[PDB]
Amino acid sequence: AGPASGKIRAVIGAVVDVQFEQGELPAILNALTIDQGNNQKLVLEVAQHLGENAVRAIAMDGTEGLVRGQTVVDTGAPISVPVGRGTLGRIINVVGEPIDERGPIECKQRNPIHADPPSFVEQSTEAEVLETGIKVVDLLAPYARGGKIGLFGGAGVGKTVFIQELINNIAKAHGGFSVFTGVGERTREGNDLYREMKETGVINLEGESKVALVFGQMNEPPGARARVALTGLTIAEYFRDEEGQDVLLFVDNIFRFTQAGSEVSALLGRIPSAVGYQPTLATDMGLLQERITTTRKGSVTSVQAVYVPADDLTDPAPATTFAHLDATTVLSRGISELGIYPAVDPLDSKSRLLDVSVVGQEHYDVATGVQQTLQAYKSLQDIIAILGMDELSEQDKLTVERARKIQRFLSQPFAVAEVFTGIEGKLVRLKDTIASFKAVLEGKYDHLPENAFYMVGGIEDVVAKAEKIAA
Amino acid sequence: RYEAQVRQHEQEQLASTVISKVQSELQNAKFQDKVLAQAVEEVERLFAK
Amino acid sequence: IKPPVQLFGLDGTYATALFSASAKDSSIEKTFQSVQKLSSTISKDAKVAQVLSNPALSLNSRKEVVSVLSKELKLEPVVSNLLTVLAENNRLSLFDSIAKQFSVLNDAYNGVVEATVVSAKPLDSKILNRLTKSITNSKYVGPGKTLKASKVNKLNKVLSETI
Amino acid sequence: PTEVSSILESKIRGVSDEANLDETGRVLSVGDGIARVFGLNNCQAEELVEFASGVKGMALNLEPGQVGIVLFGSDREVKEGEIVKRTGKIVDVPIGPGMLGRVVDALGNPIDGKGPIEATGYAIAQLKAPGILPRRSVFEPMQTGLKAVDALVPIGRGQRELIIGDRQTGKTAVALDTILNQKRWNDGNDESKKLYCVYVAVGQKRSTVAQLVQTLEQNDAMKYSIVVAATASEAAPLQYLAPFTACAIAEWFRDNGKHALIVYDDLSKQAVAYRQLSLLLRRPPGREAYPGDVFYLHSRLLERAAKMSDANGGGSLTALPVIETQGGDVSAYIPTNVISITDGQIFLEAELFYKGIRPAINVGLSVSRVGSAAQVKAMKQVAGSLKLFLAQYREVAAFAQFGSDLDASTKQTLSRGERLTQLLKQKQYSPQASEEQVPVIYAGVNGFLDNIPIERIPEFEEQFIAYLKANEGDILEAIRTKGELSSELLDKLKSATETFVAT
Numbered sequence A: 001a002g003p004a005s006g007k008i009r010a011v012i013g014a015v016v017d018v019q020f021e022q023g024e025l026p027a028i029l030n031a032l033t034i035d036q037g038n039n040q041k042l043v044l045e046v047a048q049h050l051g052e053n054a055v056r057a058i059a060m061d062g063t064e065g066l067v068r069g070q071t072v073v074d075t076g077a078p079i080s081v082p083v084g085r086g087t088l089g090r091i092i093n094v095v096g097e098p099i100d101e102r103g104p105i106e107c108k109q110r111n112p113i114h115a116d117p118p119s120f121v122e123q124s125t126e127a128e129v130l131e132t133g134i135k136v137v138d139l140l141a142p143y144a145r146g147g148k149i150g151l152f153g154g155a156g157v158g159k160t161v162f163i164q165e166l167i168n169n170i171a172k173a174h175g176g177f178s179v180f181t182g183v184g185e186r187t188r189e190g191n192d193l194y195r196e197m198k199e200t201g202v203i204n205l206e207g208e209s210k211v212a213l214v215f216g217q218m219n220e221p222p223g224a225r226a227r228v229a230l231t232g233l234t235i236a237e238y239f240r241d242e243e244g245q246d247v248l249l250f251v252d253n254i255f256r257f258t259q260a261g262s263e264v265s266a267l268l269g270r271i272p273s274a275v276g277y278q279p280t281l282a283t284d285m286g287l288l289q290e291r292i293t294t295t296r297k298g299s300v301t302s303v304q305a306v307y308v309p310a311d312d313l314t315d316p317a318p319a320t321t322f323a324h325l326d327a328t329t330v331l332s333r334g335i336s337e338l339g340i341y342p343a344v345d346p347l348d349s350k351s352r353l354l355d356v357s358v359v360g361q362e363h364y365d366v367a368t369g370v371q372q373t374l375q376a377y378k379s380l381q382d383i384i385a386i387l388g389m390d391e392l393s394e395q396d397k398l399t400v401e402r403a404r405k406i407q408r409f410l411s412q413p414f415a416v417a418e419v420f421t422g423i424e425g426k427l428v429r430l431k432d433t434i435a436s437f438k439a440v441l442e443g444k445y446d447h448l449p450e451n452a453f454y455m456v457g458g459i460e461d462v463v464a465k466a467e468k469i470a471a
Numbered sequence B: 001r002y003e004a005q006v007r008q009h010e011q012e013q014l015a016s017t018v019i020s021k022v023q024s025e026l027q028n029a030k031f032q033d034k035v036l037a038q039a040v041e042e043v044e045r046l047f048a049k
Numbered sequence C: 001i002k003p004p005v006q007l008f009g010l011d012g013t014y015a016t017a018l019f020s021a022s023a024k025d026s027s028i029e030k031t032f033q034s035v036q037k038l039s040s041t042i043s044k045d046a047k048v049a050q051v052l053s054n055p056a057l058s059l060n061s062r063k064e065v066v067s068v069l070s071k072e073l074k075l076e077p078v079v080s081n082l083l084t085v086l087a088e089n090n091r092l093s094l095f096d097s098i099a100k101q102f103s104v105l106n107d108a109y110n111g112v113v114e115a116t117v118v119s120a121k122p123l124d125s126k127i128l129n130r131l132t133k134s135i136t137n138s139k140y141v142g143p144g145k146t147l148k149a150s151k152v153n154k155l156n157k158v159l160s161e162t163i
Numbered sequence D: 001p002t003e004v005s006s007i008l009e010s011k012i013r014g015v016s017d018e019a020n021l022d023e024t025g026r027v028l029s030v031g032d033g034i035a036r037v038f039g040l041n042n043c044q045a046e047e048l049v050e051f052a053s054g055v056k057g058m059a060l061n062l063e064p065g066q067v068g069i070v071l072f073g074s075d076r077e078v079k080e081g082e083i084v085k086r087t088g089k090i091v092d093v094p095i096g097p098g099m100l101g102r103v104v105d106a107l108g109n110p111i112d113g114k115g116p117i118e119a120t121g122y123a124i125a126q127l128k129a130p131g132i133l134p135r136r137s138v139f140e141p142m143q144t145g146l147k148a149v150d151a152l153v154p155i156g157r158g159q160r161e162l163i164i165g166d167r168q169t170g171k172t173a174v175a176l177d178t179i180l181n182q183k184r185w186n187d188g189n190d191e192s193k194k195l196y197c198v199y200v201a202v203g204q205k206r207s208t209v210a211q212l213v214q215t216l217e218q219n220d221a222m223k224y225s226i227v228v229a230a231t232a233s234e235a236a237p238l239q240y241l242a243p244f245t246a247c248a249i250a251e252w253f254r255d256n257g258k259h260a261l262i263v264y265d266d267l268s269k270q271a272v273a274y275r276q277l278s279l280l281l282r283r284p285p286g287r288e289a290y291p292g293d294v295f296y297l298h299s300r301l302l303e304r305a306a307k308m309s310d311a312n313g314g315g316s317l318t319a320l321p322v323i324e325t326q327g328g329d330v331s332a333y334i335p336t337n338v339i340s341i342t343d344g345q346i347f348l349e350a351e352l353f354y355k356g357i358r359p360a361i362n363v364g365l366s367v368s369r370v371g372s373a374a375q376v377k378a379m380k381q382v383a384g385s386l387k388l389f390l391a392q393y394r395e396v397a398a399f400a401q402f403g404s405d406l407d408a409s410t411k412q413t414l415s416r417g418e419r420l421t422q423l424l425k426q427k428q429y430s431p432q433a434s435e436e437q438v439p440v441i442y443a444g445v446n447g448f449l450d451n452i453p454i455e456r457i458p459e460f461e462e463q464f465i466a467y468l469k470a471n472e473g474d475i476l477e478a479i480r481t482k483g484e485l486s487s488e489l490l491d492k493l494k495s496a497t498e499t500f501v502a503t
């Protein structure tokens, strides 16, 4: 066979320059195999070409043990991954290998991780709402079916708990298959997510599974973290185009894809951008977000989670992802310390399905009335810290009491957060959340206390908590 | 929409079969294609000089 | 005297600077055969190639290679001065680039170049390029030309854009 | 019709018959969009190139040994040793009246799937702006449809109005309502009153461009509006040249006798694409990781949209660039450069959008450099008195929390200022004409709306507009045709508003 054999000439970090022959050099985004001492291999993706029969490749694993002059064979194509129904229930890696100790993935076809996105003529617009179960998600920013969802938040606010609670009540009852592709996560978060799906019926080792697991946390190098988003999206794109199913891609976190490319951008010969980022920030983020859309063959509801750098939405990795998402669930660090579980911002979160032609005329008035009462309470709270409560009249006194009870009523106890809260998990529907918010804004629950709505469900749980606390 | 999809599918299927037959004929050592390539290069260079 | 051949500007200026002083009193024909003997006795020899990539040298192993490849080789004019300028400036590792740029100056000002189809063309040393291309294409197409890609790729791309 | 596939196969059979003139140079290195092409001595600056795989390029860094060309596609198709070809021309795009109704890309190719485009000319992307002798004063009025935009910062034909704002605060909402409000003039026969829109979506995703084109086609607004599709999934050369390609196609209407309106959405996405290609071409950077020509890149494309004089044709071109700010800071790096070069900027805060102001337009921060010279005479009479009442009520708005200590002059300014701000709030995709906005502004500035409540301001806007179209139809039609108000129009408008305010 005519295998393109190359010789290693330089190795500094994750970047490794391979020197091949004239004319037989590989192209960009090509997987390069390398024989090591163990039974595995060293996958290397070609990034650019320096010239003189040499191309700089980025290793997807540990670069320790490579000498100057080793054999580097080329696969001829890109990083192939296993697709189809065989990848459901198994823990795949960035190169398409199993990491669950359950044998090899018996797949009939293997698609590449590098592929072009959809065109403008193949796009299919929609305006369908998706019920999640939370009271603050079904009234403020509603999630769109088949669109991109972004859960923005800082460190320790509630980004990992938001993606786990929504998958246990939407992905477990959906018709399609899920695709949990974690990029830049932790070592303990990968083992806890696989054990929770087996006890609920999402991943069956002896039956049928509907959730694709893609490993790749921060324990590897910079090459495996940047290629974890392309390997996980290749399996979910085949089920919506070839099979025609509503796939659900869960990325955790979405901010780790942009930070992984900037770690090896300095050694590849590129100048740094702003805040120590790469110059191709808008080009690399747009090529992967446009491919996870909804076409004419099927839909794809992406529920990624963005991580803000030390609670800052004006960064280059957080502001660039806000234009490629329909519903944005931004979280604040100030609401999480007061007792709101979770810290859902009622004014910073916006969505495209929050109109009167998609949710109706009755649901549009409740969303506008709750946002006006919460925004007016911020201006009146500044005058009470210097003048006091004597400056408030009859209308300002009733608005301060109604704003505190409405903020605690939207915080419901999640099912996955039962070990930290203690209470049981409650799930409210879309019709029960709109009827409970409209009755409290009119004056039907003004005599109740603020503790009856905190950590409760709908209108039925608020009336039972008030009678039990008074006895 | 059904008539346009049936017409586009028939034109795409006919173009794919014609492209496979043209590639299989050039790999069978076509004697007429090799002699026509040398005569086309000599006639183009004489017209520009 | 600078000839219009460009040839880069930083790396290709090594052979262009020495070509001005070597083009006097007919001293350009002897520089072609002497430059080929320096590259053939340092590449496929495995004897004097012990200081090609090392950073040692330093007078001792730097001036001994320029005197052994000029006195006992085939040099008597100003051919020995080319190796002394590259030894003090640390430029002995790229000896193939200095010898390849010297043969391109004699083939451009006294002959044709470029290409055409299949293999190479004829590269005549007449005068104009239009009168020499028409007289050499008719004699080379008949004699030989086995014709054993470009036309098949252009026809397939035009049919896919209209469908 | 009768074997339509046989007509296209016969016309595409003979085309390649004169392509034996070599090409240009080769390729030495390629990566991250860059392509070090070795050779091509006859290639000019900013010229189109072509690779051996089919990807196009633009040679912008002409060095001595090599030539830096920016590829417009993926870097996987180019390799070390590929042959390159020179087109011989500069970076141009198609223009003319045949591009109306189809979504084109950054190079002029149609992506909507409606066949070819009948281009009447070919204009370059990097074109010169108009001089100081071929420009006139802004006298024509640009009807946007909003009540708070047509009275406060009124924009005209030939000016540059910036659309600053934060994330989700009324940025693209002001540009979409102004292009859809021109259906009353483009559907008629007056060519001087029509204004062809030119939405240039740059930096947006694939789902955002498909949703905006579907909403304009349902309201009969996509037949005379150019769409420049430029997503972020392409190369950096295609997104950076989207502002230059959209300005060349819209300039053909202003040079003939028509009007145009460009909407560069957004201005923040165009600055990030130009800095990405310059950082990979071995160049020194400046402030905020930008090149040296950061202020000259946005001022050159905005100065070409001006109003010509009567000797040049009488056309004009509007530029609506949206500046996406970070967190409300209007004095940043890219925000200060676009506001200083434009003749006005519309600010949009995120705090006023959640209160009830639709859209959030701050009257104390947004202003127009043209003033009342580019507006109608009928709307200028009501906008003069409303400007003084809105400015005095904003500075005394802190006394609204203590209503039990108001005086005589303090109670009149608070009641009139609250009714004037709520009457200008309109819904999405609901623009008003010049005749309907002149009757609503006269009832709040005179004192006919002070007796109504604050909660009944939404019901009074639809009740007064519907009753004026059936009872006093002669007063609404005379204000739109003549465009002014005489002595007979002022007495008839005061008698009709007083009789309808008693019920």
Ligand SMILES: Nc1ncnc2c1ncn2[C@@H]1O[C@H](COP(=O)(O)OP(=O)(O)OP(=O)(O)O)[C@@H](O)[C@H]1O
Pocket: A322, A323, A351, A352, A354, A355, D166, D167, D168, D169, D170, D171, D172, D173, D174, D357, D358, D359, D360, D426, D427, D428
């Ligand atoms: N005056 C208004 N009244 C009601 N809703 C509005 C108004 N203006 C904007 N909106 C809502 O805001 C949403 C986004 O509007 P727009 O497209 O103008 O901003 P955007 O481009 O989404 O902002 P960003 O680019 O920061 O996401 C729309 O879905 C629309 O429903």
Ligand SMILES: Nc1ncnc2c1ncn2[C@@H]1O[C@H](COP(=O)(O)OP(=O)(O)O)[C@@H](O)[C@H]1O
Pocket: A154, A155, A156, A157, A158, A159, A160, A161, A341, A342, A413, A414, A417, A420, A421
């Ligand atoms: N519904 C909830 N109720 C109480 N605590 C919660 C809830 N959701 C999340 N938390 C807390 O938020 C913390 C999030 O931790 P971690 O996932 O490490 O950071 P991040 O959420 O930023 O990824 C957890 O320690 C958990 O105790």
Ligand SMILES: [Mg+2]
Pocket: A159, A160, A161, A252
């Ligand atoms: Mg987490």
Ligand SMILES: [Mg+2]
Pocket: D171, D172, D265
């Ligand atoms: Mg926008």
